[PDB]
Symmetry: C3
């Protein structure tokens, strides 16, 4: 509790943990191979998130980066979380609409670039350059959003759940580059405790909130 942001990291940890356990119990019994796929993907997401929230809470996922003539606290563990979780979440949307492998690779490759360049931006020591990396990560984000709207016989429950989950994704994901820009990785207008609060609300909605909508749907069943 030395750092003011501990509370939001604690709550993130708890909520990802409880979400994972909920999904895990909910997907017991599931015999449908397609349903198993969606549960496996959607439960793994908050499982990984739990581990990386814990790491930040305990101090392990935090590093100091010198820039602006300061030693800046950067939580590097978010990118380790997002490196795996954001593609799994895109895979959830991809499988729902029976995407072509070529489209799956494009989403996943663009997403790896999004998070990888975002990470490089987070750890870059020349201040002006950090925003060069932010711009590149955002171009990759915009690509991903474009494919979700314009890149994809489909059952009506699948169509309907996809349109909901796609709208949840556009709104929530588009917010991340904004928090990063105004927070302590970027311009440093909003302090880290508030930034951490913003990412915890964003992540819990994008993982547990997303997963509740998906796993309650008939779309996950063949």
């Amino acid at each position: 509790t030395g750092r003011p942001e501990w509370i939001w990291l604690a709550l993130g940890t708890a909520l990802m943990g409880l979400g994972t356990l909920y999904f895990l119990v909910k997907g017991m019994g599931v015999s449908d191979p397609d349903a198993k796929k969606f549960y496996a993907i959607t439960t793994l997401v908050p499982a990984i998130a739990f581990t990386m929230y814990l790491s930040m809470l305990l101090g392990y996922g935090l590093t100091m980066v010198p820039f602006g003539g300061e030693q800046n606290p950067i939580y590097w563990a978010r990118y380790a979380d997002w490196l795996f979780t954001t593609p799994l979440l895109l895979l959830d949307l991809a499988l729902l609409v029976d995407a072509d492998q070529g489209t799956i690779l494009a989403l996943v490759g663009a997403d790896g670039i999004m998070i990888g360049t975002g990470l490089v931006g987070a750890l870059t020591k020349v201040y002006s350059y950090r925003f060069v990396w932010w711009a590149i990560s955002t171009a990759a984000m915009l690509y991903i959003l474009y494919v979700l709207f314009f890149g994809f016989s489909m059952r009506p429950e699948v169509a309907s759940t996809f349109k909901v989950l796609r709208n949840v994704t556009v709104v929530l994901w588009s917010a991340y580059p904004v928090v990063w820009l105004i927070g302590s990785e970027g311009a440093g207008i909003v302090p880290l405790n508030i930034e951490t609060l913003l990412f915890m609300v964003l992540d819990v909605s994008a993982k547990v909130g997303f997963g509740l909508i998906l796993l309650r749907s008939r779309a996950i069943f063949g």
Copy 2:
């Protein structure tokens, strides 16, 4: 030869190397696509292991971690080995029984969490926390063991080889958290040379020993 554990790292290196070459020569000629799969997976495992044993032997895969008021030698390269090899080994079991993709992802995701949290525990500088990570890695291990027994028309040679390899896995894998807890990553009761000896016997049995049983079986052929 400055460090007493060099011998076991040398022998591990030799034995993984010779195993890889044996499997490589054994899988020449193989035309059956299913058989190719099992050889590719089972030969890659000791190939990666060879590289990471060499790295520890040469000094590259070793790092000092400060905890307990000591500078502790931690061989970080084991987790780089296991990050890739333990899933490949689970993939061997998964393909043998024609597992659903949802089950394959669950095993592989749980295994990534097992090794990733194990790594974080290995490098953590607050002593009490290291065992928080050990506990979490063990929960993920227990999950994996559960799926192998309760998560899975099957040919009798496949059934029979699976039950052998599953029993080899349960016995050998369950030993790793024990060695780690009592060794120099954990409570520091057993010294590092003996710990290194325990992991070399464990790894060689779990990779080369496992691979001998699998690759001698008729189960690998469609």
Copy 3:
């Protein structure tokens, strides 16, 4: 522009960037699922390369390694590029000839070992050992070349484009271990600026040059 090699890193960055945009525009409209696969793979390659060239140009992808009694500049970001791009390129060849999954895994696993051991060699602080890692990476390279010639009903356009792209691969890839050995990672005969020039010509040919030949071919269409 403090370091003489900046020019080649700038030009590499520009050329990978323009290549990516060219491929991206060229693969708009593509409805054929097989064609989408090849574009997704072949566009992702210079996309990742662009990011890692930029990182070297900006200073981020550079590190000092002490060996020979010097502080040696090693561009570590090449291996982060190649870790993902060389397998994707092998996947391009693999899918062209309808390779068995067992062969795909062997190529990809051998390639991961090639680049991983190459990375360990690049960062190793005992000079003589660096070349132990170089030897091991080269054995893995030779394995890969062997499979491409001896490891693989096939349409004649596919046969023909494969033989072209395979010859482009053998010639270009075999050059990398040579540049590394005589450059600043190895014996230090050729200085870093010239070495950087050699890798930029090699990478642009192997990614954009390769991709031009592949994406202009009828082989990519089912």
